[PDB]
Paper text:
Structures of TbMDO and TcMDO comprise residues from 11–261 and 13–257, respectively and share a highly conserved structure (RMSD 0.84 Å). While the N-terminus of the TbMDO folds back to the core and extends the β-sheet, the N-terminus of the TcMDO packs to the precisely same site but in the neighboring molecule in the crystal. Also TcMDO contains proline in this position indicating similar binding mode of the adenine moiety as observed in TbMDO.
We show that the trypanosomatid MacroD1/MacroD2 homologues are hydrolyzing both protein-linked ADP-ribose and free O-acetyl-ADP-ribose. The macrodomain fold (starting from residues 99 and 92 in TbMDO and TcMDO, respectively) is well-conserved between the human MacroD proteins and consists of a central mostly parallel six-stranded β-sheet surrounded by five α-helices.
Author numbering:
A (entry chain A), B (entry chain A): 13 to 257
The structure:
Amino acid sequence: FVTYSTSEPAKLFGEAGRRSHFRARVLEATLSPLEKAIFDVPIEEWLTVDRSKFSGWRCAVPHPVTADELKPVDSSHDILRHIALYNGPVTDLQLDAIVNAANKTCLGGKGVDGAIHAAAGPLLVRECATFKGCDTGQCRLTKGYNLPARYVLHTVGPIGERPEELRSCYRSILSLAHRNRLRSIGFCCVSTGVYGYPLIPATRIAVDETIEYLKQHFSAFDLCCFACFKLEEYNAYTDCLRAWL
Amino acid sequence: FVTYSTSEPAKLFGEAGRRSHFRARVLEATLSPLEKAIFDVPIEEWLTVDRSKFSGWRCAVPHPVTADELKPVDSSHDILRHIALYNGPVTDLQLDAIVNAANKTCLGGKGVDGAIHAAAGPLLVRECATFKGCDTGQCRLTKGYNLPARYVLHTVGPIGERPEELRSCYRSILSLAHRNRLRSIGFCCVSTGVYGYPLIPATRIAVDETIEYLKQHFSAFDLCCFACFKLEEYNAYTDCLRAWL
């Protein structure tokens, strides 16, 4: 078997040119009047506008899930009344923001990242192309475009099992949402999955940081929802929350 | 609104470290005995083995589509009896190979690339990590693992509308499949979609190269199938094939 269509290169060198070239093509593309109208809404204004007034805006989710439909893990508990689990994709959630597990370029990728870009539509990556990427453990904020949610919080988790970098992601998301007075957030499972942060330790950290933030800042959030696409993820949160209790 | 969780960096610099680090974590991971058994099958041997004999192998597609279920565009025509269209994901196809629209690193990404890695399972990226990426217009061959198809042909199409680079992809895929005596190939729509190669010109090229290969090499293939996830794509092939006739 031959396994490549030409001679092998001198060594591995390709990658960063593709991404800069993609970023360049995204920035250079001509937006329609429909798209431009949506794209120019100032970011802070997007929270509250009526998005149906733009013919370019087509909600990507047929039946979005609103905050009133998300039951907390314990309505009696002073902290855990602000926490809910959703057994489905984070893109269903019509909240102030959802979290995207991004990479340093913020230009899309596999997994939840690709799902979010696909639901939000082409303007999401256009907004991401305009800023200088995202560092590991930090968070960027954009509009959510065709998402039911208003904003996306793009964070960059660690590749491996680096507890202090993943902690930082949760800290950055929570502080940035709070700074902008966003009151409901839908999380995805940052850094988990194939070759990533093992599920239970990751979930431990997510739960621990989010509860610590809620304890220390009474007035910050109405709801933090952990969207758990897979049943395994849902059960990890359930166990960690029960183990936290 | 604050849109980033810390100070802006001096300039955009991050990206290539993440990918090399991901590649490193993939290569360093310990395979199970089940996985190792599958992974060590020599590539040329994989075509013909009985994959059900490995407990690690779980076909990712419940009801795969075999070549006998793929009707050609014209059974009377000497060339077009070897061409079929499928209105569904390329991952359904149980053929000798399917084509992945990859990036230069071959480590996964958005779109069909992510779909293929997800269906094939974690060993696909492990095999990709072992080689020196893929150049634009060239093609790499790997085993397909949990895919119904035996192999994956990872090509790197151009980002923009570069006809000679996309031609090269089709030429590389076709010549590499033929060199290895693979006789049935499932294509995806290389380089198309948001910010990419416009659909009709891309499809023109795919059709033109594939038919030219079939004309010149009578004995190469039994079937080339264009998997068209979206109806728009299906109609583009139908029009190009009809326009070729």
